[PDB]
Design a protein around this ligand. Structure first.
Ligand SMILES: CCCCCCCCCCCCCCCCCCCC(=O)O[C@H](COC(=O)CCCCCCCCCCCCCC)COP(=O)(O)OCCN
Ligand SMILES: CCCCCCCCCCCCCCCCCCCC(=O)O[C@H](COC(=O)CCCCCCCCCCCCCC)COP(=O)(O)OCCN
Ligand SMILES: CC(=O)N[C@@H]1[C@@H](O)[C@H](O)[C@@H](CO)O[C@H]1O
Lengths: 539, 541
């Protein structure tokens, strides 16, 4: 009886009780910083627990700040929907344009054909393709895009009789091979998300917070430098993740193991089967002018990203120096140009060309607005802006100095152990909740702590920001895990056991590279720079 | 080139040629204001013709300003999505909650019970109610409020076979019918017309009153709450009645018995008696109000009261009590949106303690609304459209085009007084069609003040008609927010709105030009003369 009352209605209890229990913080102290801290506590507990939808919880600052004395109504609304947020939204729209007309399927099938026909080769190809795609698209999107192909090839393999998808007899228990494939795709999505700023929202969150807090920083996380910093590590631990999965489920180094014998059965007489499946499933047709135009636009956008301001030559944004252009011009330019351009060029037959039939009506463009309106997560605006506004209000009210002075006791530790504990805390926290929420909670605290100690802020912000995306153990940790558990009836225990490999691999790889090669990318991570000294003296 | 080429692909020709054809504007002139003018001209032609989707066209300033050197990229993006935009979006979300609980169906059946279930009578009643309500609130608030009620009324009429909501038929939404156009355009126009009744009706009124008061202290004539209402109400009533007659003639058949639409209205009038029993039976079919609807209604009443009572100008208002930071109307709206998610839809959970008779719920109780519903129903391109309006106005100020437009009008001093008044009204109406109302007021009012001082006439004589005329926008979805909202809610093409808006334009122009010269003399006896303080100010000039 009374036991399950907590099982069903605990969310309402949290919503009703937490704001009342946190009042003494506000009532017993007089400053505005304590009002801001009350707000931060309530928002953090709502985010971690998910008693309210995240997008709705992010709206609270709009009501809270003007009621208190923090900021006016107009400033708070302007803090939402910044420049970087518009870049992110435009990136989503361009990725939708790519998904429309089916370019991703073309690329994936072509690469899989390039790589071999053995089951291990097929697995390697799937992981590499998913990582490369997830560099530019939302992780859940990429998982949904890749799952059907592997499902089809497994279905055919079972049909011919090479292998069994499910154990013989409550949903059926998946076998080892299907676990290997699906978990590989799910993990590869998350791993590849970390390579690019537009790869996932967490990177945008922590880059934006860092750039808002310290506007005078000599070091910069712009699009090319961030990619230089992140790509090698991504490659290393993606490769290492693939080796672990093969040893865990396919007996890579044990010949006597039964799993190895199953791989040998797949090698003999099944490569031709799945090769036939891929060749037939590549019946898309010849490459059309529609896809060619989309590809050229995408390449042009990326090239514009790298040419905004390199040191080797001037490039644009220095020829056009009346204002700042800042990477929103190319993205929206491409989005508009998608609507302007046609898709056929069949109408030129009127203008003294023989050709064939003339069109019967207006020619469609490369994309339609209805597609965009229905396949964009519009709540990300509120989520990201709420994070930014909370950070800004925390800076202005004066909570930052309070927390920084509070936590100055950690100076006795050496740098390496502090880095390790920060990474561990980030991973442990993100195991249970959304990545964006954890980034929002922990990044400003790290900035203030870094100021209080004599440590370069980037040294701690960047590795932790990357680590917030590493979630493999539980279905609630990240959306791709939930999707994959849904598709193949994966029990939580197997996922939790299998997630041990990627966790340790990523922790070690980040710990080593951030000390060794990040110095090559940023030569001043070890010393406390001058601008940080000025900021700390001011605060 | 057969004629079918122009019949099928003219949109592409417009898109390809207009940017090249308008290029001499900025090639032959040497300022930033001309560059801004080129941008504005091209965007206007794209808006009227509809060669691109409206939402896409509204994105162009983000690309255009940083390249042209008018204003930076970070600033331009923030001019989008201002405070007022948050208020608009919150208003749309609150309306969806009313639709989710089916409160709208109950309210519509009550109105039909009161009025009598005939098309003309209901149309007249709804227009009058919208006008009266919009005397006190923002226009967009009233339009977002009234859209679902109109939807429910149309559904009830269609259920009995009186009319058809949409035409029969891949991605283009259904074309609306004559009567649907009548109703939706009616409520949009009624909001715009009723906004001109009182000072607190709309922001334009406060804007030009403030400009006039700041420029002229020691002014014998006053613009306070009673006098402005006394001056403005009769003219508003005339606008609204004449507008209702034009809409009924244009869409239904009012003076044409032969018209098919008139026959459709006549058959509905004949059967209205049995429809009365059908309607009251259907209303009884619904049960008593559930707690879900009661909570939604209480929240809605609270939000409206909060809107009205913030700086009303007659008493204090809660804005003055909390003056540490400026608080605007987005606070109550988002407050209501959050409280919709917080509160429960049912109170069965209390049965666990001290209520043995009630059965245990056996599941998590739902809230008043779900986020999936909001994600599907809100038209999100309105963000780009309205923000584009705001950013375009601000860029016009910073570039220097606004001062050029203002200096253009100085040459009109040579005309006699009556012709001068008519031309001023015409210019205000023309410019307000492509921009926000506040920006046009800011552009044109000060120049009129200086001109009136130079030409020896009473400043109010020109200021009041033009200030009211800045709010007469009826042709395009970008002219004023209510038009954009109604176009979004029911898919209305720009061509239909542009053709239908001819009536209100002529009606309002003529009636303003007459009622000013006649009635203002009664309200302000010295309007024709040139008073003493004006002489002092002109001498000091
Ligand atoms: C100097 C100035 C200082 C100012 C300080 C202000 C501090 C307060 C700030 C505002 C807080 C407002 C909170 C109001 C919302 C409460 C929502 C309660 C939800 C609820 O009843 O949950 C159920 C269990 O409740 C329970 O078991 C708990 C008992 C609930 C009793 C009824 C509570 C609501 C009564 C009406 C409150 C009206 C408040 C108006 C302001 C299970 O719900 P679930 O999990 O199934 O689903 C929930 C989602 N749908
Ligand atoms: C300091 C000074 C700076 C000055 C800057 C000035 C900038 C001006 C920019 C103008 C060019 C960009 C905007 C137009 C892009 C092309 C639009 C083509 C439209 C088109 O082809 O429409 C078809 C007919 O075209 C025709 O009949 C037209 C002739 C054929 C056009 C072919 C276009 C594609 C090849 C060239 C691309 C050039 C790209 C340059 C970036 C019929 O289309 P429909 O109506 O059936 O369907 C439309 C579905 N949306
Ligand atoms: C305050 C300011 O604008 N100037 C600082 C300068 O003092 C400092 O040396 C440099 C980092 O080395 O950052 C910049």
């Amino acid at each position: 009886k009374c036991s399950n009352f907590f099982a069903n209605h605990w969310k309402g209890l949290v919503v009703f009780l937490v704001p009342l229990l946190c009042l003494p913080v506000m009532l017993l102290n007089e400053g505005a910083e304590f009002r801001c801290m009350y707000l931060l506590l309530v928002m953090a507990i709502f985010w971690v627990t998910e008693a309210l939808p995240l997008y709705v919880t992010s709206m609270i600052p709009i009501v809270a700040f003007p009621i208190m004395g923090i900021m006016s109504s107009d400033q708070t609304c302007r803090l939402y929907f910044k420049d970087t947020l518009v870049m992110f939204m435009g990136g989503i729209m361009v990725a939708l344009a790519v998904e429309y007309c089916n370019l991703h399927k073309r690329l994936a099938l072509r690469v899989i054909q390039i790589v071999g026909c053995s089951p291990r080769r097929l697995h390697f190809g799937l992981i590499m393709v998913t990582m490369f795609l997830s560099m530019w698209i939302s992780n859940a999107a990429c998982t949904a895009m890749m799952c059907p192909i592997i499902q089809a090839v497994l279905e055919e393999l079972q049909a011919q009789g090479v292998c069994k998808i499910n154990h013989e007899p409550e949903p059926p228990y998946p076998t080892k091979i299907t676990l290997c494939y699906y978990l590989g795709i799910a993990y590869a999505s998350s791993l590849g998300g970390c390579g690019t700023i537009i790869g996932t929202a967490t990177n945008l969150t922590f880059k934006g917070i860092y750039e808002a807090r310290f506007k005078n920083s000599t070091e910069q996380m712009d699009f090319p430098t961030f990619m230089f910093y992140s790509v090698p590590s991504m490659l290393v631990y993606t490769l290492l993740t693939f080796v672990f999965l093969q040893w865990h489920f396919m007996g890579l180094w044990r010949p006597k193991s039964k799993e190895a014998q199953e791989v040998q059965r797949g090698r003999e007489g099944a490569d031709v089967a799945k090769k036939v499946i891929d060749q037939r499933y590549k019946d898309l047709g010849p490459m059309s002018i529609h896809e060619i135009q989309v590809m050229i636009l995408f390449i042009f956008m990326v090239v514009m990203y790298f040419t905004r301001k390199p040191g080797i030559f001037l490039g644009w944004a220095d020829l056009l120096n009346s204002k700042d252009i800042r990477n929103s011009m190319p993205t929206i330019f491409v989005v508009v140009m998608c609507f302007m351009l046609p898709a056929n060029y069949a109408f030129l037959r009127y203008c003294t060309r023989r050709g064939g039939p003339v069109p019967t009506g207006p020619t469609p463009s490369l994309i339609t607005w209805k597609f965009i309106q229905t396949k964009v997560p519009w709540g990300l605006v509120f989520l990201l802006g709420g994070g930014f506004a909370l950070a800004e209000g925390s800076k202005q009210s004066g909570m930052a100095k309070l927390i920084g002075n509070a936590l100055i006791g950690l100076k006795v530790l050496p740098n390496s152990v502090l880095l390790l504990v920060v990474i561990l805390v980030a991973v442990f926290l993100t195991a249970f909740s959304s990545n964006v929420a954890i980034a929002n909670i922990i990044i400003p605290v790290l900035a203030e702590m870094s100021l209080a100690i004599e440590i370069h802020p980037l040294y701690l912000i960047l590795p932790a920001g990357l680590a917030c995306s590493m979630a493999f153990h539980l279905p609630v940790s990240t959306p791709p895990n939930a999707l994959v558990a849904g598709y193949a009836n994966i029990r939580t225990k197997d996922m939790a056991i299998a997630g041990i490999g990627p966790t340790i691999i990523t922790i070690i790889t980040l710990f080593v590279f951030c000390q060794t090669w990040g110095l090559v990318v940023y030569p001043n991570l070890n010393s406390f720079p001058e601008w940080a000294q000025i900021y700390a003296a001011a605060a």
